[PDB]
Amino acid sequence: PNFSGNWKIIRSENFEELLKVLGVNVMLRKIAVAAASKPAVEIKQEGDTFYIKTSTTVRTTEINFKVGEEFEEQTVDGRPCKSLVKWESENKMVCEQKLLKGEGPKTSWTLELTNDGELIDTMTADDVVCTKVFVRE
């Protein structure tokens, strides 16, 4: 049940389409899905404490969180939110998000490890799901 490693993306599904239904303009959508925006994910897990750094060729962000403790981040389309991660099972965490200001779609994410050691990242906004899959370097 160790999420640690340097994760490289091998599958992405419904990502631009998710951005589309959220009203993200076509320019940014095309930016977000270019080869150059391919995310590399570095995780350090120490029990329930996580450091996750997501990096592309042009952007780098990090979240530090402990499961069960509220933290602040941003939704898929960059809106500040308060997040709370909970274990759904030994190999899967789920994060509920609540906008800090205003109203919006219901957004959440999940991270889970398969027994073949792939990392599955899902992002939901209301009734729309995007799935990405990573493997370790």
Side-chain angles (χ1 to χ4, degrees):
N2 197 334
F3 286 71
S4 311
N6 296 297
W7 293 97
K8 311 305 173 167
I9 187 177
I10 65 162
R11 298 292 296 268
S12 180
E13 187 73 37
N14 208 31
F15 180 59
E16 164 162 28
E17 293 84 355
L18 165 59
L19 300 178
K20 185 172 188 183
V21 310
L22 293 175
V24 171
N25 77 56
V26 59
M27 298 285 301
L28 310 187
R29 298 208 305 270
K30 289 308 169 180
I31 283 165
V33 286
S37 314
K38 182 188 288 182
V41 175
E42 176 187 337
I43 296 174
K44 185 186 214 75
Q45 178 189 357
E46 303 199 328
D48 281 349
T49 300
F50 287 82
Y51 161 79
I52 308 181
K53 184 188 221 207
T54 306
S55 300
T56 70
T57 66
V58 260
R59 283 183 166 77
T60 317
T61 40
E62 29 170 21
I63 63 175
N64 290 275
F65 67 88
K66 179 161 153 79
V67 169
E69 309 189 354
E70 298 171 351
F71 65 103
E72 281 173 19
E73 52 169 354
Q74 287 194 345
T75 61
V76 59
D77 48 354
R79 298 162 75 180
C81 68
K82 183 173 86 173
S83 293
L84 176 61
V85 178
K86 204 96 195 194
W87 285 117
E88 169 168 300
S89 81
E90 196 171 34
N91 73 316
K92 165 173 179 178
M93 74 190 90
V94 174
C95 181
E96 48 152 3
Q97 290 175 331
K98 196 198 306 203
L99 285 162
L100 287 175
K101 296 190 172 180
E103 283 143 302
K106 202 197 180 187
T107 58
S108 56
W109 61 253
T110 77
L111 268 188
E112 71 198 293
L113 276 180
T114 72
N115 220 297
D116 286 351
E118 288 123 3
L119 177 76
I120 302 167
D121 169 337
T122 82
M123 303 131 264
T124 303
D126 291 333
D127 51 342
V128 186
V129 180
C130 164
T131 295
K132 306 182 183 180
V133 185
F134 299 82
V135 298
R136 274 189 190 97
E137 188 189 43

